[PDB]
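Budget justification note: compute hours in this period were largely spent on complex prediction jobs such as the one shown. Inputs:
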Amino acid sequence: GGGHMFNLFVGNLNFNKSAPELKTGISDVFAKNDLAVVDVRIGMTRKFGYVDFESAEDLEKALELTGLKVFGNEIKLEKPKGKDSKKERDARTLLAKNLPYKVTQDELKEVFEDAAEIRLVSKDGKSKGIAYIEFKTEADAEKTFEEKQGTEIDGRSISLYYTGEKGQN
Amino acid sequence: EISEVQLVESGGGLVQPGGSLRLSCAASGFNIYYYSIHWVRQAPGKGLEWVASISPSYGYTSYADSVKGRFTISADTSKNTAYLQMNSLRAEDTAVYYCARWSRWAYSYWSYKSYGMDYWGQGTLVTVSSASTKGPSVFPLAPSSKSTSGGTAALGCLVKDYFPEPVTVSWNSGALTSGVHTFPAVLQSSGLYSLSSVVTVPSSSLGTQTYICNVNHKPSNTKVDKKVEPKSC
Amino acid sequence: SDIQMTQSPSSLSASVGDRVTITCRASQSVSSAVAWYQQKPGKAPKLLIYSASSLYSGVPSRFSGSRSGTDFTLTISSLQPEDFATYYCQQSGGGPITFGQGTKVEIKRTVAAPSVFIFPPSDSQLKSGTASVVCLLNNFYPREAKVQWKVDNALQSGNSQESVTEQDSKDSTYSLSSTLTLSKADYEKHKVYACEVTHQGLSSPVTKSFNRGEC
DNA sequence: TAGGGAGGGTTTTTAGGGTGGGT
Ligand SMILES: [K+]
Ligand SMILES: [K+]
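Corresponding output:
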């Protein structure tokens, strides 16, 4: 589910400094601005990281800081673009993971009038059924979720479920 | 990096053989989703034994062979807590269980190939036994019948047949550290623990003496105080 | 699991200032995913080395770690009084993580005489149906000691339990308490009981015995 | 479908999740 603790992406780090040094430097500037983060979590290339906050309130305060300098670099705090991702979507993204075996891409998929992609997933050699059909709806997509209800792909029947964060039990 | 990293274990205690017990590892000071949480147990008098680990970001879990299939490790990121449910418990599973965190977060999938277990909890005790709570049945403070002339005389206080530990113990007074020893408890075939405690005594000056015992059993309420005197036959 | 760390010597005695060496050998290639831990009694383990050569923050520089293939070495250049503990090596390169058997580093002192003792039951064991015959070794060194029970000619086997203390923090000595258990019927119908010791500190073995109560 | 981390777990359709299973 991507975790539950609120966190922020920090970019433009001085990669010449080690990860422990960057953890201290990022913590100090927030501490100097009267903000107590809980962890820093430098990334692999050390050009970026992910700052953890105890509450959404501390996070929103952090995003409104300006001109933060660590080791000579002006770091930038970004809300990770998961809101632009399927957090808003997947009410307009369906899954029809093929329930049989390998099939053809240009197999006259006439069961969907309006959709932007029905590309399946194939591996080296044989493949199993993974084919999610995209969507272009706004108020959920129930015009297609309840409209398929057991089509007939080659081999056996098929199924249509959710993807992303909508079908997560 | 500043926030105090702390791991707290709970849920340990007494469980019957074949039963199930669930341990909780409350985490603070870091995001439990992006780290790896490991459970390590240590049997009484034995070394460390790795049990299980979970890496929620990659959905990766691992178990030791001795516990594979029986134990199940899970995490509730909403509470920042890791769980270890132990099924089909046996007497060899009786140990002190710790939960630990990796030194660095899962920056890469290869992150397990470096770093180590950074922070540990206090450790909670899990005891698997069919025996029920009982109190001590302390026995002697009997010296040697064939003693010596002022060289050295040995007392005793045998604390036997109690369940479970601890048995925090002393002698007559509140502080009589003089050459005193408290041996570790031993697990008998009956399922109960027996223990012994001795002290140094001058073989010449034993008329005044004292040397009553101070056996204490916390979850038994069975404080028994036995006295010292050579036998007569 | 299936990846085992063979830790040696699993026990060594040394003095303050000595240079100690603890070596772990991996049964399979783990590259460098090896960590070293220090544990003191009644406490959680503390990390010392990670990546087989990187000191954890706060660890004194007298600790170090080298690698020569599948062999991983923990080196203490000058042993310190607070370094006497048990050290464990850990593998994380393969699948499940495994620890070594541990190496206990005990303080080194001169050899001391055990001063054996032996005691009879306590008037309630006689009135409870069980016999508990003790044999105490008091303030001896080294830890190596062999105790022996004898039923008037016969070495008792499978009926005794003994426990040893840690090094006393005034003399760096140990203490042992063996306890033979027998039913009253077995105990009431025999004569001559004794416990025998074979400690290296005594030229000839010392046997302590009491025919019966004989008080 | 079931092996490895150069396929990917905070975004640009390769799948996503952990009852599919082990790094
Ligand atoms: K995977
Ligand atoms: K996979």
